[PDB]
């Protein structure tokens, strides 16, 4: 997709016009056209946003797992 | 707009407008250098099938000595003749831009070395 | 159902090729390669894809349309 033309096909240059960026120097395409990346990242990031955290075992009472709005107030 | 919708027309003024934004870029120059050399092949091209100045590769030519002047560096003299030397017709223009290396860029180690490489390339050892 | 103003109005995006004709030359580098095209025979701009607003120069610029649809 970056760089297939009909030229290439085609023969009438020896080398074709580079771009200096290519796409797997990028994050690469968001869609697929034959036969992710950000899903990686919201489970990543929503995995470090998690009760269970380093020294969880050395906490020695539990916090509690719900709270009324009342109390929190 | 060249290799697909095959206007150089309009691949021209896309690359001409490119340089006032950007007159510093030396990756704008070689690409717009490689493209008009494209140009001349096609031309070539046209007429072996069925003018003068441009089929000599003068055009390409004018982005040569301009570039050189805005960007004043031996490297990307050196690159120009690169994509010339890719190029087998307009041989005179790889001797014009060959010759032009040591008489204007001297004094740097650059030039002396690519002297040196273009000379290297039981009996045979 | 009436629209007003009566007047059409275009469309908000203009596909390049109409945008290419409103430029002119300023920088040298420009100036040598304008120069260059209209002491020969080759033109600026395509034909077919810039259009231009609504005798015999008509009639061999008709011909050379022709020629670059072919």
Not at chain 1, 60 to 69: A, G, L, Q
Not at chain 2, 105 to 125: F, G, M, S
Request: net charge neutral; aromatic share 8%.
């Amino acid at each position: 997709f970056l760089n297939s033309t009909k030229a290439k096909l085609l023969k009438l240059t020896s080398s074709s016009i580079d771009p200096g960026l290519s796409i797997k120097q990028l994050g690469g395409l968001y869609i697929n056209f034959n036969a992710t990346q950000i899903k990686e990242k919201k489970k990543n990031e929503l995995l470090q946003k998690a009760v269970i955290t380093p020294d969880f075992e050395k906490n020695h009472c539990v916090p509690p797992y719900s709270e009324s709005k009342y109390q929190l107030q | 707009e060249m290799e697909d919708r095959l206007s150089s027309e309009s691949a021209r003024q896309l690359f001409l407008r490119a340089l006032r934004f950007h007159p510093e870029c030396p990756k704008l120059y070689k690409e717009y250098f490689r493209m008009e050399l494209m140009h001349a092949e096609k031309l070539r091209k046209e007429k072996e099938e069925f003018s003068e100045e441009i089929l000599k590769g003068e055009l390409a030519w004018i982005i040569y000595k301009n570039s050189v002047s805005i960007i004043k560096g031996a490297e990307f003299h050196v690159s120009l003749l690169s994509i010339a030397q890719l190029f087998d017709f307009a041989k005179d223009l790889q001797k014009e831009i060959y010759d032009d290396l040591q008489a204007l860029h001297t004094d740097d180690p650059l030039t002396w070395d690519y002297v040196a490489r273009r000379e290297l390339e039981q009996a045979k050892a | 159902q009436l629209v007003f103003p009566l007047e059409k109005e275009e469309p908000a995006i203009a596909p390049i090729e109409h945008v290419l004709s409103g430029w002119k030359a300023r920088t040298p580098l420009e100036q040598e390669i304008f120069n260059l095209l209209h002491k020969n025979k080759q033109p600026v701009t395509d034909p077919l894809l810039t259009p231009v607003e609504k005798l015999e120069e008509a009639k061999m610029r008709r011909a050379e349309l022709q020629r670059a649809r072919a």
